[PDB]
Amino acid sequence: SPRPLSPLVELNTSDLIKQKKQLWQRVQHDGAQFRSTPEERKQFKTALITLWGEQYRPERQQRWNGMMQRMAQMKWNHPELKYMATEDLVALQAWTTDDYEVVQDVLEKEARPTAHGLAFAKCIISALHSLPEEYSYQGTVFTGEDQLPDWVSERYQERSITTDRRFFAASETKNASWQGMAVEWESNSTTGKRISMFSERPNEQEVLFPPGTRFQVTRIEENETHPRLKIYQSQIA
């Protein structure tokens, strides 16, 4: 337990694989009922602030404080969000920073997770399942990622359902700016959540799916050029 007036709490760094497996089972079991606990929200705060050691804690503390105040006001400006946990909303903004790298694949099989990443993941997932239904995007969303062809083959196959263990990001638009990544997706979304209201780059019109999302893969096109593989899939909501 922390000392009085401590900004931080202890992160459970022991048996990380068990923690990963336990969170993954919780994701599947709880579905859209998944919610972060008050203690998990404090662990996310510590995770973000301490992500890069004591040297960067003052800067990250200041960023944390600013995001908390922004999301507190977000609830005033957008009353439908009044019941969201403020730290859950902060997680959505944090996802759109470079910290995404510590959390995107943290529930993947054989991925070696950090305590920080697992703490990140709980609040993002909680945010995605507690956002009101008006934040769900119904339509086709577009993704590009830098992945190898074998990475695709392990996870996606024509005519079979993919149960995604990753955070899967996409966009409502297909801007020319990110043309030519190694892999592309065209995904029909039913409950993918629009996070442009929380992003550091709202013009990207990003949509985000949590681990546990299921996609029916309907076609995979192959090209010699990048994108080497283009995946057509539909969310099973």
Q: How far is CA 51 from the centre of its chain?
A: 17
User: Can you read off the two tokens belonging to residue 133?
Assistant: 């239904």
User: Can you read off the two tokens belonging to residue 103?
Assistant: 């959390």
User: Can you read off the two tokens belonging to residue 215?
Assistant: 């996609």
**Amino acid identity of 70?**
R
Is 96 within 8 Å of 201 (Cβ atoms)? yes
* C-alpha atoms less than 13 angstroms from C-alpha of 185 in its C-beta half-sphere: 28
What was the experiment behind these coordinates? X-ray
Is 226 within 8 Å of 181 (Cβ atoms)? yes
Return the biggest CA–CA distance within the chain.
Answer: 60
Resolution (A): 2.0
Q: What is the dihedral of CA 24, 30, 32, 36, to 10 degrees?
A: -80
- CATH superfamily, with its number, for domain 1-237: Toxin ADP-ribosyltransferase; Chain A, domain 1 (3.90.176.10)
Is 143 within 8 Å of 157 (Cβ atoms)? no
Nearest Cα neighbor of 162 from 218, 222, 91 is 218
